[PDB]
Structure 1
Amino acid sequence: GSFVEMVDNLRGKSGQGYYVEMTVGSPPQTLNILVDTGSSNFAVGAAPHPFLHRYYQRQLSSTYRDLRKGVYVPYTQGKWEGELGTDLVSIPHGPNVTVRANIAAITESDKFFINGSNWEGILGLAYAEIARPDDSLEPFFDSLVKQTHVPNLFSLQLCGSVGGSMIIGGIDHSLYTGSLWYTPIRREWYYEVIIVRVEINGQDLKMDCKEYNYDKSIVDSGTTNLRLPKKVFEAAVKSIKAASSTEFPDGFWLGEQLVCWNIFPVISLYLMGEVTNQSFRITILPQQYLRPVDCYKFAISQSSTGTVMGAVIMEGFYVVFDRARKRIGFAVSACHVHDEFRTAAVEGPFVTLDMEDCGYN
């Protein structure tokens, strides 16, 4: 219910994701590690790349064990690759435990480390199914729960240098107001969920809900934007365009250029609820989808791999990754940025029929 040592354990830079301090090896080596609910590998710099403040030096760790296996991870502009092993890992501002975890020692990369960033690795918090090389490489959180008494859940309050909290093993009730509302984790690979309805300023998009989840919807701390399937993004922008016709170029809506609150509509996503024919809705503000760069980028964008509820969504809410119950809880975040008129919201219950049809097969 209360985990004060873990509050404010996240830092970062806008558009660059949130990191937690971790230690690896014996004696402990401190690194800053990006928190990513959209992947499942724990991977750290292990060589003196010129952008790195520091890196894992396996030769200094008495507890290091080599797995003698490579791992190669290309993603979308572009890549990291490394050497697998295990070692002792802890989170100084997390639970008072140390575990033996898989660690990919990064030995080559492309467009991975960021010039001027203050992080040296990534913590994939999603499930084994999407671990590389394959699902037999146990993810860090799986190892943590297996080797300790840490409950099988964590929660995130991303506040928007930005700050936030990762509560490992529980929920901190001071981080949210009102009630938590839960949506099922559809399948344990990404943190996959089902959107059953979309409103802009209360106006339904009238789209076949199946489109909202084409070909999936995921909750992803490792993505800045709210990302939507093109068909959905088209209707979204058309509506976001109309709502704000009162006062911007076409390239803006495409993230091709920048522009320098009440004119802009709220966005509600209704999520599948816990009960048959029952849903709830989460509502965000322009302050969430208009992120400082007073020049802002439009932080809603299009996708070929489905809806991605990135930091734009998550900074509105306290998000509970209730792995034990295969569900994700949303509540209004106690730190979310609002004005005096409108506030981010989590509301229910609503009656929504045929919600099962919204999931793509």
Structure 2
Amino acid sequence: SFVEMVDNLRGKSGQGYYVEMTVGSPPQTLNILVDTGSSNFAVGAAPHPFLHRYYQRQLSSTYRDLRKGVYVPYTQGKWEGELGTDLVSIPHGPNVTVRANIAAITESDKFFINGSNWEGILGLAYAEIARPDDSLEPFFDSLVKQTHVPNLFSLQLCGAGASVGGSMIIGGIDHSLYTGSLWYTPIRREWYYEVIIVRVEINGQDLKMDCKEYNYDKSIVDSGTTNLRLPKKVFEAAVKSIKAASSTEKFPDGFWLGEQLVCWQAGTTPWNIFPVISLYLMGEVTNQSFRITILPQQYLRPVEDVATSQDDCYKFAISQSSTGTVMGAVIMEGFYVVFDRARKRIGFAVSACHVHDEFRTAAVEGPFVTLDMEDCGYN
């Protein structure tokens, strides 16, 4: 019984997906970015030039100070604040209210985004990576412990159609939101949502790297990062192959770094020259894997043309990483992703809001046979 949570996510392209939440008594409404890459629930609690509203602890009668400070650094951005607890609910989520830890953000650096329409972050990953330490219970843990909500959620992130939308199904799977079968990959370790990539193909050709390189030093599923982020060695190989496949057209080197945009006359984007990327994930049974296939419509993110919006302009949404693979929003978009915490696995299926290429199609396909998959995890 999940129809009430369908379409409960909003956002702007490249600025994250948010869900509406309320904090305190009486309830204060805030838009909260959904981040499977972290584990702290934090909200702006002091004025900031990019915040249209913030959490006012003095107006909540159920607020409780924990008299302990907190700091969270991310790959990009950081904030510091004061810890406390309060009553939290999700208007378009389960009909429950829980007491959860809340970090009241008092100072921040490159965290809030001008005009994003969100004021806080909901870290949905595990306690192991919560700050200041893993004794700070994350929100979803509190939700499961205090109510009957099952220990899982799913994310259906939909692309354009600059507005963006989607669904966060709290406590289950909504079968009307995907087609075909769900394919599951083990959660390697409960800290980030860590997975193991066992093979990479571009336009059907194996990159033929040591599969440890794909997971160096980890691979995570992260709704709070836009791009697909790849370790240096993998990024270089992927860009070389993508450049070769599209070499009939000229792009500035700044394009391949995410610095400059590429444009084409409206409706003439040469999709056919950009390859499909297949990520093979470790499966549920011995020597078995499955693949998810990414179309160029996912890793060429449309950007609104600031000048004369007569052209279709895009940014390369694959970037280099020094902290492992990050399967960001552009990978998740077009798939229905099940964070099955109870069974320690992540499921993928083709989304009902999938990308529409005229001759190619995003897919989740299996089974494949893959020997020695555990050797692909980095130690």
* Interval containing the TM-score (normalised by the shorter chain): over 0.9
State which drifts further: 270-279 or 339-348.
339-348
Deviation by residue 1:19-78 (Cα, 9 ceiling, x = unmatched) = 000000011000000000000000001112222111111111111111000001233443
Partner of 1:335: 353
Partner of 1:284: 294
For residues 76 and 305 of structure 1, what CA distance do their matches in structure 2 show?
A: 9
| Closer/same/farther in 2, CA of residues 77 and 6 from structure 1, 3 Å limit | closer
For residues 270 and 42 of structure 1, what CA distance do their matches in structure 2 show?
A: 32
Deviation by residue 1:189-213 (Cα, 9 ceiling, x = unmatched) = 0000000000001110010000000
Deviation by residue 1:211-230 (Cα, 9 ceiling, x = unmatched) = 00000000000000000001
For residues 345 and 274 of structure 1, what CA distance do their matches in structure 2 show?
A: 18
For residues 75 and 227 of structure 2, what CA distance do their matches in structure 1 show?
A: 15
For residues 115 and 327 of structure 2, what CA distance do their matches in structure 1 show?
A: 26
Which 4+ residue blocks in structure 1 deviate beyond 4 angstroms? none
Query: SS of the counterpart of 1:109?
Result: strand
Matches within 5 A, 1:212-231: 212-231=214-233
| Closer/same/farther in 2, CA of residues 72 and 336 from structure 1, 3 Å limit | same
Deviation by residue 1:2-31 (Cα, 9 ceiling, x = unmatched) = 410000000000000000000000110000
For residues 252 and 222 of structure 1, what CA distance do their matches in structure 2 show?
A: 23
**Any unmatched runs of 5+ in structure 2?**
264-270, 303-311
For residues 360 and 346 of structure 2, what CA distance do their matches in structure 1 show?
A: 24
Deviation by residue 1:286-317 (Cα, 9 ceiling, x = unmatched) = 0000111x110000111000000001110021
Aligned length: 359
| Closer/same/farther in 2, CA of residues 77 and 199 from structure 1, 3 Å limit | closer
Deviation by residue 1:87-113 (Cα, 9 ceiling, x = unmatched) = 000000000000000000011111111
| Closer/same/farther in 2, CA of residues 288 and 54 from structure 1, 3 Å limit | same
Query: SS of the counterpart of 1:51?
Result: coil
Partner of 2:178: 176
Query: SS of the counterpart of 2:112?
Result: coil
TM-score by length of 2: 0.93
Q: CA deviation at 1:251?
A: 1.9
State which drifts further: 223-232 or 246-255.
246-255
1:200 equivalenced with 2:202 (yes/no): yes
**Contact map agreement 1:285 1:338 (CA 8 A) in 2:** no
**Contact map agreement 1:48 1:55 (CA 8 A) in 2:** yes
Q: CA deviation at 1:176?
A: 0.5
**Any unmatched runs of 5+ in structure 1?**
none
1:268 equivalenced with 2:271 (yes/no): no
Deviation by residue 1:240-283 (Cα, 9 ceiling, x = unmatched) = 11111222122211112111111111000000000010000000
For residues 109 and 233 of structure 2, what CA distance do their matches in structure 1 show?
A: 31
